[PDB]
Structure formats: C-alpha cells, structure tokens
Tab-separated table of C-alpha atoms (C1' of nucleotides) and ligand atoms in Angstrom:
chain	number	residue	atom	x	y	z
A	1	UNK	CA	0.046	-0.080	0.103
A	2	UNK	CA	1.892	3.182	-1.342
A	3	UNK	CA	1.801	6.138	1.468
A	4	UNK	CA	0.096	9.093	-1.469
A	5	UNK	CA	-3.571	8.353	-2.360
A	6	UNK	CA	-2.237	9.277	-6.071
A	7	UNK	CA	-0.260	6.035	-6.126
A	8	UNK	CA	-3.212	3.540	-5.653
A	9	UNK	CA	-6.865	2.856	-7.290
A	10	UNK	CA	-9.706	4.064	-5.012
A	11	UNK	CA	-13.108	3.054	-6.143
A	12	UNK	CA	-16.152	4.699	-5.356
A	13	UNK	CA	-17.800	1.969	-3.646
A	14	UNK	CA	-15.349	-0.656	-1.493
A	15	UNK	CA	-15.185	-3.368	1.149
A	16	UNK	CA	-14.522	-0.889	4.495
A	17	UNK	CA	-17.693	1.543	4.024
A	18	UNK	CA	-18.050	1.637	7.778
A	19	UNK	CA	-14.866	2.084	9.156
A	20	UNK	CA	-13.998	4.591	6.878
A	21	UNK	CA	-17.528	6.673	7.803
A	22	UNK	CA	-15.997	6.516	11.357
A	23	UNK	CA	-12.499	8.008	10.455
A	24	UNK	CA	-14.221	10.871	8.160
A	25	UNK	CA	-16.426	12.278	11.127
A	26	UNK	CA	-13.178	12.537	13.404
A	27	UNK	CA	-11.401	14.220	10.736
A	28	UNK	CA	-14.337	16.400	9.941
A	29	UNK	CA	-14.494	17.111	13.834
A	30	UNK	CA	-10.959	17.791	13.709
A	31	UNK	CA	-11.246	20.569	10.879
A	32	UNK	CA	-14.026	22.283	12.505
A	33	UNK	CA	-11.536	23.080	15.582
A	34	UNK	CA	-8.603	24.267	13.135
A	35	UNK	CA	-6.705	21.144	13.139
A	36	UNK	CA	-5.969	20.726	9.718
A	37	UNK	CA	-3.075	18.086	10.104
A	38	UNK	CA	-5.002	15.664	12.264
A	39	UNK	CA	-7.678	16.376	9.785
A	40	UNK	CA	-5.713	15.063	7.022
A	41	UNK	CA	-3.871	11.999	8.512
A	42	UNK	CA	-8.006	10.935	9.437
A	43	UNK	CA	-8.833	11.159	6.212
A	44	UNK	CA	-5.793	9.457	4.422
A	45	UNK	CA	-6.506	6.435	6.777
A	46	UNK	CA	-9.631	6.629	5.927
A	47	UNK	CA	-8.801	6.736	2.105
A	48	UNK	CA	-6.517	4.052	2.458
A	49	UNK	CA	-9.521	1.613	3.880
A	50	UNK	CA	-11.217	2.531	0.684
A	51	UNK	CA	-8.455	1.378	-1.554
A	52	UNK	CA	-8.232	-2.253	0.082
A	53	UNK	CA	-9.453	-5.383	-1.404
A	54	UNK	CA	-11.424	-6.882	1.441
A	55	UNK	CA	-13.126	-5.962	4.652
A	56	UNK	CA	-10.633	-5.687	7.751
A	57	UNK	CA	-11.813	-8.216	9.815
A	58	UNK	CA	-8.713	-8.134	12.356
A	59	UNK	CA	-6.356	-5.574	13.774
A	60	UNK	CA	-3.665	-7.386	12.260
A	61	UNK	CA	-4.340	-6.298	9.167
A	62	UNK	CA	-3.643	-2.574	10.018
A	63	UNK	CA	0.239	-3.131	10.294
A	64	UNK	CA	2.004	-1.632	7.861
A	65	UNK	CA	-0.471	-0.003	6.478
A	66	UNK	CA	0.272	3.960	6.040
A	67	UNK	CA	-1.716	6.231	7.928
A	68	UNK	CA	-2.677	4.031	10.876
A	69	UNK	CA	-1.231	4.888	14.175
A	70	UNK	CA	-2.146	4.248	17.914
A	71	UNK	CA	-5.323	6.767	17.220
A	72	UNK	CA	-6.774	5.278	14.158
A	73	UNK	CA	-5.912	1.942	15.143
A	74	UNK	CA	-8.182	2.188	18.201
A	75	UNK	CA	-10.701	3.519	16.414
A	76	UNK	CA	-10.688	0.543	13.849
A	77	UNK	CA	-10.395	-1.978	17.241
A	78	UNK	CA	-13.363	-0.602	18.448
A	79	UNK	CA	-15.799	-0.955	15.829
A	80	UNK	CA	-14.578	-4.431	15.154
A	81	UNK	CA	-15.079	-5.366	18.752
A	82	UNK	CA	-18.220	-3.407	19.473
A	83	UNK	CA	-19.602	-2.282	16.445
A	84	UNK	CA	-19.293	1.432	17.728
A	85	UNK	CA	-16.584	3.623	18.596
A	86	UNK	CA	-16.864	5.755	21.867
A	87	UNK	CA	-15.163	8.665	20.497
A	88	UNK	CA	-16.839	8.794	17.229
A	89	UNK	CA	-20.768	8.870	19.142
A	90	UNK	CA	-19.044	11.299	21.260
A	91	UNK	CA	-18.702	13.826	18.338
A	92	UNK	CA	-21.770	12.749	16.496
A	93	UNK	CA	-24.321	13.551	19.446
A	94	UNK	CA	-22.039	16.712	20.786
A	95	UNK	CA	-23.343	20.189	20.262
A	96	UNK	CA	-20.821	21.474	18.706
A	97	UNK	CA	-20.006	19.053	15.645
A	98	UNK	CA	-24.162	19.225	15.108
A	99	UNK	CA	-23.994	22.940	14.710
A	100	UNK	CA	-20.585	23.625	13.013
A	101	UNK	CA	-21.754	21.011	10.340
A	102	UNK	CA	-25.493	22.597	10.047
A	103	UNK	CA	-23.796	26.143	9.603
A	104	UNK	CA	-20.511	25.057	7.253
A	105	UNK	CA	-22.926	23.341	4.929
A	106	UNK	CA	-24.831	26.563	4.236
A	107	UNK	CA	-23.170	27.947	0.963
A	108	UNK	CA	-21.281	31.539	1.865
A	109	UNK	CA	-20.363	29.944	5.700
A	110	UNK	CA	-16.947	28.574	6.249
A	111	UNK	CA	-15.464	26.774	9.311
A	112	UNK	CA	-14.313	30.573	10.673
A	113	UNK	CA	-17.974	32.127	10.183
A	114	UNK	CA	-19.742	29.170	11.537
A	115	UNK	CA	-17.239	29.166	14.988
A	116	UNK	CA	-17.706	32.646	15.528
A	117	UNK	CA	-21.373	31.795	15.282
A	118	UNK	CA	-21.313	29.146	17.405
A	119	UNK	CA	-19.159	31.499	19.723
A	120	UNK	CA	-22.078	33.901	20.084
A	121	UNK	CA	-24.648	31.344	21.193
A	122	UNK	CA	-26.029	30.911	18.160
A	123	UNK	CA	-27.172	26.982	17.212
A	124	UNK	CA	-29.962	26.932	14.520
A	125	UNK	CA	-30.872	28.021	11.054
A	126	UNK	CA	-33.844	30.208	12.422
A	127	UNK	CA	-31.502	31.946	14.554
A	128	UNK	CA	-29.575	33.140	11.710
A	129	UNK	CA	-32.594	34.092	9.900
A	130	UNK	CA	-33.815	36.321	12.951
A	131	UNK	CA	-30.755	38.331	12.554
A	132	UNK	CA	-29.931	38.426	8.809
A	133	UNK	CA	-28.391	42.174	9.404
A	134	UNK	CA	-25.525	39.906	9.845
A	135	UNK	CA	-25.642	38.121	6.862
A	136	UNK	CA	-23.443	38.380	3.049
A	137	UNK	CA	-25.475	38.445	0.037
A	138	UNK	CA	-24.444	35.095	-0.424
A	139	UNK	CA	-24.825	33.782	3.122
A	140	UNK	CA	-28.508	35.149	2.597
A	141	UNK	CA	-29.395	33.228	-0.730
A	142	UNK	CA	-27.480	29.996	1.234
A	143	UNK	CA	-29.818	30.240	3.797
A	144	UNK	CA	-32.940	30.849	1.944
A	145	UNK	CA	-32.261	28.181	-0.524
A	146	UNK	CA	-30.837	25.700	2.332
A	147	UNK	CA	-33.391	23.005	2.096
A	148	UNK	CA	-33.279	22.416	-1.474
A	149	UNK	CA	-29.618	22.507	-1.544
A	150	UNK	CA	-29.399	19.783	0.737
A	151	UNK	CA	-31.016	17.444	-1.710
A	152	UNK	CA	-28.598	15.707	-3.234
A	153	UNK	CA	-28.525	16.159	-7.186
A	154	UNK	CA	-29.138	13.176	-9.118
A	155	UNK	CA	-27.076	11.899	-12.042
A	156	UNK	CA	-30.742	11.536	-14.076
A	157	UNK	CA	-30.691	15.602	-13.768
A	158	UNK	CA	-27.300	16.486	-15.181
A	159	UNK	CA	-27.736	15.473	-18.336
A	160	UNK	CA	-31.018	18.077	-19.169
A	161	UNK	CA	-28.739	20.479	-16.955
A	162	UNK	CA	-25.533	20.264	-19.364
A	163	UNK	CA	-27.857	20.955	-22.118
A	164	UNK	CA	-28.864	24.175	-21.109
A	165	UNK	CA	-25.752	25.129	-20.444
A	166	UNK	CA	-24.225	24.119	-23.290
A	167	UNK	CA	-27.231	26.138	-25.558
A	168	UNK	CA	-26.173	29.143	-23.795
A	169	UNK	CA	-22.270	28.557	-24.206
A	170	UNK	CA	-22.663	28.024	-27.705
A	171	UNK	CA	-24.161	31.668	-28.090
A	172	UNK	CA	-21.555	33.158	-26.171
A	173	UNK	CA	-18.554	31.251	-28.529
A	174	UNK	CA	-19.834	28.836	-31.024
A	175	UNK	CA	-17.446	26.274	-30.914
A	176	UNK	CA	-16.679	26.425	-26.859
A	177	UNK	CA	-18.096	23.145	-25.300
A	178	UNK	CA	-18.817	22.242	-21.693
A	179	UNK	CA	-17.613	18.921	-20.275
A	180	UNK	CA	-18.980	17.473	-17.421
A	181	UNK	CA	-16.251	16.892	-13.852
A	182	UNK	CA	-16.429	16.637	-10.473
A	183	UNK	CA	-17.922	13.895	-8.422
A	184	UNK	CA	-20.017	12.727	-11.499
A	185	UNK	CA	-16.903	12.251	-13.429
A	186	UNK	CA	-15.953	9.882	-11.545
A	187	UNK	CA	-18.944	7.789	-11.173
A	188	UNK	CA	-21.170	9.577	-8.404
A	189	UNK	CA	-24.989	9.140	-9.142
A	190	UNK	CA	-25.418	11.597	-6.527
A	191	UNK	CA	-23.717	15.116	-5.958
A	192	UNK	CA	-24.409	18.123	-4.141
A	193	UNK	CA	-23.625	20.164	-7.498
A	194	UNK	CA	-22.868	20.032	-10.901
A	195	UNK	CA	-19.259	20.858	-11.755
A	196	UNK	CA	-18.651	21.951	-15.637
A	197	UNK	CA	-15.259	22.924	-17.211
A	198	UNK	CA	-15.887	25.190	-20.876
A	199	UNK	CA	-13.009	25.481	-23.084
A	200	UNK	CA	-13.067	26.240	-26.779
A	201	UNK	CA	-10.190	24.126	-28.939
A	202	UNK	CA	-8.674	27.359	-30.402
A	203	UNK	CA	-6.374	28.889	-27.882
A	204	UNK	CA	-7.413	32.537	-26.868
A	205	UNK	CA	-10.869	32.421	-27.981
A	206	UNK	CA	-12.296	31.634	-24.222
A	207	UNK	CA	-10.397	35.155	-23.041
A	208	UNK	CA	-13.960	36.459	-21.441
A	209	UNK	CA	-16.212	33.851	-21.962
A	210	UNK	CA	-17.761	33.246	-19.004
A	211	UNK	CA	-19.330	36.587	-18.394
A	212	UNK	CA	-21.085	36.376	-21.244
A	213	UNK	CA	-22.128	32.753	-20.616
A	214	UNK	CA	-23.767	34.318	-17.132
A	215	UNK	CA	-25.675	36.723	-18.826
A	216	UNK	CA	-26.903	34.321	-21.295
A	217	UNK	CA	-28.190	32.111	-18.687
A	218	UNK	CA	-29.435	35.106	-16.178
A	219	UNK	CA	-31.381	36.339	-19.333
A	220	UNK	CA	-33.271	32.617	-19.971
A	221	UNK	CA	-34.140	33.383	-16.106
A	222	UNK	CA	-32.482	30.255	-15.125
A	223	UNK	CA	-29.896	32.186	-12.547
A	224	UNK	CA	-31.344	31.932	-9.078
A	225	UNK	CA	-27.938	33.593	-7.784
A	226	UNK	CA	-24.985	34.400	-8.955
A	227	UNK	CA	-22.112	36.659	-7.921
A	228	UNK	CA	-22.117	38.892	-10.749
A	229	UNK	CA	-25.941	39.443	-11.225
A	230	UNK	CA	-15.039	42.855	-14.407
A	231	UNK	CA	-13.406	39.646	-15.529
A	232	UNK	CA	-13.597	36.232	-13.990
A	233	UNK	CA	-13.168	32.570	-14.723
A	234	UNK	CA	-15.044	30.497	-12.345
A	235	UNK	CA	-18.716	30.880	-10.853
A	236	UNK	CA	-20.477	29.359	-8.035
A	237	UNK	CA	-23.806	29.835	-8.713
A	238	UNK	CA	-27.470	28.526	-7.726
A	239	UNK	CA	-29.512	27.533	-10.679
A	240	UNK	CA	-33.322	27.001	-11.199
A	241	UNK	CA	-33.818	22.813	-12.233
A	242	UNK	CA	-37.277	21.521	-13.369
A	243	UNK	CA	-39.408	19.027	-11.424
A	244	UNK	CA	-42.363	17.867	-11.832
A	245	UNK	CA	-44.841	20.790	-11.785
A	246	UNK	CA	-42.394	22.663	-10.389
A	247	UNK	CA	-38.515	23.376	-9.984
A	248	UNK	CA	-35.598	23.451	-7.573
A	249	UNK	CA	-32.594	25.217	-6.652
A	250	UNK	CA	-29.395	23.451	-7.407
A	251	UNK	CA	-25.613	24.531	-7.145
A	252	UNK	CA	-23.835	24.683	-10.601
A	253	UNK	CA	-20.149	25.530	-10.504
A	254	UNK	CA	-18.924	26.905	-13.867
A	255	UNK	CA	-15.296	27.300	-15.098
A	256	UNK	CA	-13.380	28.381	-18.146
A	257	UNK	CA	-9.947	27.224	-19.441
A	258	UNK	CA	-7.722	27.618	-22.129
A	259	UNK	CA	-7.685	24.645	-24.032
A	260	UNK	CA	-3.537	24.685	-23.353
A	261	UNK	CA	-4.548	24.298	-19.632
A	262	UNK	CA	-7.450	21.858	-20.136
A	263	UNK	CA	-5.869	18.497	-19.251
A	264	UNK	CA	-4.774	20.167	-15.811
A	265	UNK	CA	-8.295	21.876	-15.525
A	266	UNK	CA	-10.184	18.491	-15.551
A	267	UNK	CA	-7.520	16.615	-13.566
A	268	UNK	CA	-7.979	19.294	-10.690
A	269	UNK	CA	-11.878	20.079	-10.936
A	270	UNK	CA	-12.497	16.182	-11.606
A	271	UNK	CA	-11.125	15.135	-7.904
A	272	UNK	CA	-11.407	14.201	-5.682
A	273	UNK	CA	-10.752	16.863	-2.974
A	274	UNK	CA	-7.978	14.386	-1.275
A	275	UNK	CA	-6.681	13.138	-4.445
A	276	UNK	CA	-5.741	16.168	-5.882
A	277	UNK	CA	-4.293	17.723	-2.260
A	278	UNK	CA	-2.569	14.611	-2.474
A	279	UNK	CA	-1.726	14.524	-6.029
A	280	UNK	CA	0.085	18.259	-5.538
A	281	UNK	CA	2.166	16.976	-2.713
A	282	UNK	CA	3.187	13.983	-4.372
A	283	UNK	CA	4.309	16.432	-7.067
A	284	UNK	CA	5.906	18.822	-5.120
A	285	UNK	CA	7.509	16.857	-2.203
A	286	UNK	CA	8.682	13.447	-4.331
A	287	UNK	CA	9.204	14.857	-8.185
A	288	UNK	CA	10.054	18.677	-7.357
A	289	UNK	CA	7.429	19.777	-9.632
A	290	UNK	CA	4.393	22.599	-8.566
A	291	UNK	CA	1.332	21.140	-9.971
A	292	UNK	CA	-2.078	23.390	-10.032
A	293	UNK	CA	-5.156	23.233	-12.095
A	294	UNK	CA	-3.315	25.677	-14.944
A	295	UNK	CA	-0.021	23.757	-14.967
A	296	UNK	CA	2.891	21.713	-13.720
A	297	UNK	CA	5.853	24.162	-13.431
A	298	UNK	CA	9.487	22.702	-13.402
A	299	UNK	CA	11.591	25.422	-10.719
A	300	UNK	CA	14.276	24.467	-11.640
A	301	UNK	CA	14.268	24.986	-15.626
A	302	UNK	CA	11.558	27.758	-14.977
A	303	UNK	CA	9.514	26.068	-17.442
A	304	UNK	CA	5.692	24.941	-17.624
A	305	UNK	CA	4.886	20.974	-19.180
A	306	UNK	CA	2.724	20.959	-22.261
A	307	UNK	CA	0.241	18.572	-21.565
A	308	UNK	CA	-2.523	17.291	-24.255
A	309	UNK	CA	-4.145	14.631	-21.914
A	310	UNK	CA	-4.529	13.723	-18.039
A	311	UNK	CA	-2.986	10.312	-19.318
A	312	UNK	CA	0.330	12.785	-19.981
A	313	UNK	CA	0.330	14.771	-16.302
A	314	UNK	CA	0.358	11.340	-14.840
A	315	UNK	CA	3.148	10.364	-17.030
A	316	UNK	CA	5.024	13.334	-16.352
A	317	UNK	CA	4.470	12.858	-13.105
A	318	UNK	CA	6.010	8.920	-12.954
A	319	UNK	CA	2.447	7.698	-11.786
A	320	UNK	CA	0.507	5.214	-13.274
A	321	UNK	CA	-2.807	6.389	-15.196
A	322	UNK	CA	-5.845	6.316	-12.827
A	323	UNK	CA	-9.182	7.050	-14.777
A	324	UNK	CA	-11.679	8.931	-12.983
A	325	UNK	CA	-13.411	6.179	-11.364
A	326	UNK	CA	-10.346	4.992	-9.536
A	327	UNK	CA	-9.781	8.501	-7.708
A	328	UNK	CA	-12.390	8.480	-5.306
A	329	UNK	CA	-9.591	9.150	-2.873
B	1	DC	C1'	11.478	18.320	14.507
B	2	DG	C1'	8.537	20.682	9.922
B	3	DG	C1'	4.987	19.932	6.935
B	4	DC	C1'	0.305	18.973	5.737
B	5	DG	C1'	-2.435	21.802	-1.773
B	6	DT	C1'	-3.237	25.956	-4.350
B	7	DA	C1'	-5.560	28.362	-6.209
B	8	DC	C1'	-9.995	31.777	-7.540
B	9	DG	C1'	-14.343	35.395	-6.274
C	1	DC	C1'	-13.555	36.149	4.156
C	2	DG	C1'	-16.252	32.623	0.596
C	3	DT	C1'	-15.690	29.579	-3.144
C	4	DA	C1'	-13.315	24.776	-6.630
D	1	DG	C1'	-2.440	12.262	13.816
D	2	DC	C1'	0.785	10.213	11.527
D	3	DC	C1'	5.239	10.644	8.134
D	4	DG	C1'	10.051	10.727	6.816
E	1	0KX	N1	-11.472	22.282	-1.592
E	1	0KX	C1	-11.435	21.528	-3.145
E	1	0KX	C2	-12.438	21.544	-3.657
E	1	0KX	C3	-12.489	21.259	-4.325
E	1	0KX	N2	-11.582	20.554	-5.010
E	1	0KX	C4	-11.705	19.992	-6.797
E	1	0KX	C5	-11.721	18.552	-6.638
E	1	0KX	C6	-13.547	18.434	-6.327
E	1	0KX	O1	-13.633	16.821	-6.999
E	1	0KX	C7	-13.687	19.363	-7.210
E	1	0KX	C8	-15.045	19.813	-7.332
E	1	0KX	O2	-15.377	20.312	-6.116
E	1	0KX	P1	-16.871	19.884	-5.576
E	1	0KX	O3	-17.931	20.413	-6.494
E	1	0KX	O4	-16.483	20.697	-4.253
E	1	0KX	N3	-16.843	18.126	-5.128
E	1	0KX	P2	-17.504	16.652	-5.833
E	1	0KX	O5	-17.829	17.325	-7.077
E	1	0KX	O6	-16.115	16.220	-5.818
E	1	0KX	O7	-18.316	16.008	-4.907
E	1	0KX	P3	-19.880	16.812	-4.823
E	1	0KX	O8	-19.639	17.264	-3.285
E	1	0KX	O9	-19.990	18.380	-5.402
E	1	0KX	O10	-20.708	15.726	-4.975
E	1	0KX	O11	-12.933	20.334	-7.450
E	1	0KX	C9	-10.590	20.881	-4.863
E	1	0KX	O12	-9.308	20.522	-5.833
E	1	0KX	N4	-10.552	21.509	-3.580
E	2	CL	CL1	-5.485	25.467	-9.187
E	3	MG	MG1	-19.192	18.509	-7.303
E	4	MG	MG1	-18.480	22.053	-7.139
E	5	NA	NA1	-20.540	26.567	3.577
DNA sequence: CGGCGTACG
DNA sequence: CGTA
DNA sequence: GCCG
C-alpha cells in the first residue's frame, strides 16, 4: 500500500465503508477545530481503507498500512470489537459538532464564520434568519435555498442541465465545449452540485467567455444566484432545475480554461478533493514539480510542462494512470 | 522536529 | 472572508 | 495524527 492516495486506485464503492465513515467523522471534527494536520491524517487513513481489496476483520490487518497509528488503529479496533467507537459517537452527538456541521453546510459559510456564530451562542438556521443584518448576500441566498441545496443532485438531472448550459455557451462562443467534471465524472450517482468545465479548441478564444455565458443564463431566467448578477473564470451559482409541476434550486459550478490548460483543469476539477491535495503534495515533495489546475511547473528549469491529456500529466509525474472512477480517494 | 494544496471571487 |  |  503506497503512502500517497494518487499512487493507488480508489473506487467509489469498497469493502470498508463503515470504518472509513467513522474515521471521516473524526476528520471533519478536527477541521471544525482548525486542526488541519489531524484532519489530513484521518482522511488519509480512511482513504487507505477505501483502497483495500477486502474487508478489515482483524486489527493485525492494519499492520504496515500507512497513516494508521495508535489513534486510528484504536478507532478501528473498537468498531471491530463492539460495532461502535465511543469517541466517534461522542463527536456525533456533541452540540459543537452538530452545529458546526449545520452552519458550514450553508453556501457562503465556512469554518471561521460558523465558529464565530457558535461562540456568539447561535445554534439553528432560524437563529440566523432572525438576525439577517449580519449576513452577506451570498449567505442570504445560501440560507434561503438551504433546504433545496441539502437535497442530492441526481445523475439523471445532469444531462438536461448540461444541455441548457451548452445552449448558452454556444451562443456566447460558437465551438466552445462543456465537459462534466467533479464527482459525477468519477461515477457518483448523486452530488452536492454539478461541476462543468468550459473551453474552446482555439487557444485564446475563451478569454472573456464566462461573463457572456452567465449573462445568457441569467437572461433565460435560470440563475437564482450568482456573484455577478469585471473579468472572471469561475462561477459558483444557484440554478433553477425543473421538477414535476415545479422546480428546485441546485448548485452549479462553471469554470473556463484555455485549451492548453484543459488537461490540468480537468484533472483538478475531477477530484476527489483529497486525491488532488495528495497529487499536488506528491508532485512537489517527491518530484520537485509544482502542480495546480493551470499547469505543472519545473522550478529549476523555470518551465511549464505541456500536456495534451490527463494521461500526459500522470506520465510526467511518474505515476500509473488512474481513470476518474479510481480517483475516489 | 516541520510539514500538511493551491488556486480564484 | 468566501469558493473549487 | 502521522510520516519521513
Ligand atoms: N477544496 C477543494 C474543493 C474542490 N476541489 C476539486 C476536486 C473536487 O472533486 C472538484 C469539485 O469540487 P466539489 O464540487 O466541491 N466536490 P465533488 O464534485 O467531488 O463532490 P460533490 O460534493 O460536489 O458531490 O474540485 C479541490 O481540488 N479542492
Ligand atoms: Cl488551482
Ligand atoms: Mg461537485
Ligand atoms: Mg463544485
Ligand atoms: Na459552507
């Protein structure tokens, strides 16, 4: 078992679901306290179990696995012995965990904001609604739409949504393309949002595209919220999605990249989040190369690596290729 | 012990 | 600060 | 919390 998540296949469904879920509770709780290192270790340990070929049934099967030390091993031991880990259950039922989870789930609210509200004594969404002077426009939209946004987006919703985006993109710039990325490209059947990557085959033609796309979607009445409703290349919006007799709000992310950068953007936006952090960590720490969603930089030669495909990027990093379905770290 | 991803709005 |  |  290699130490970095980008060195091993991780399928969407696996053989240690309950164990990984428990470790991810502790990871999440660590993040709510600002303990990024502990969050990373618990996420990495959970991800190791996702990559195993069979269920862990005995503690000895953790020997030699990376990211399993005294703490994560004890969590697994208690789940194996008793079906429950007391530390995990104590986190689950704690007022702090429950409220931080509720607040950080709101679009426009991060850990720092949720923590400040928590320290001020706030506990429920209705607490926030009662004092709306203290909310940003983004947070007001996130709170108004929170119920719909807490409902999973279904893969069966995505194709109709992509067709609507494609129509607007084609008017904004004929020949521009829309690619489904994010969790759905990794095979997920549900998501918290839909992520779309937009480019154009002629380098430079994508300059200035996203404002034109957003204006056209807004003109069609489809945008319930966006930040520009001034150059930009990423948009985090709330979209009107049809439903029988009605509609529901859904989160949609749009990102534009020049075609020279498209493999890097596709890799980055396909995730998972942990896979990408691990890939960038591997690149820098093991290969001395700096990776982001725009490119891959050699800081000694002061040169960027041209990539025509995701396959190119894995090759330039000395990693076996993983299709998106195996990036579910 | 230091390090823990790296961007854009 | 928020967001991917 | 764990790795190197
Ligand atoms: N902090 C982050 C957030 C996202 N990302 C990348 C990898 C993610 O898969 C991709 C899309 O982000 P996302 O929409 O928040 N999550 P994802 O689509 O994987 O699953 P959902 O939660 O949307 O169902 O952006 C990242 O690299 N760092
Ligand atoms: Cl980036
Ligand atoms: Mg997504
Ligand atoms: Mg997204
Ligand atoms: Na949030």
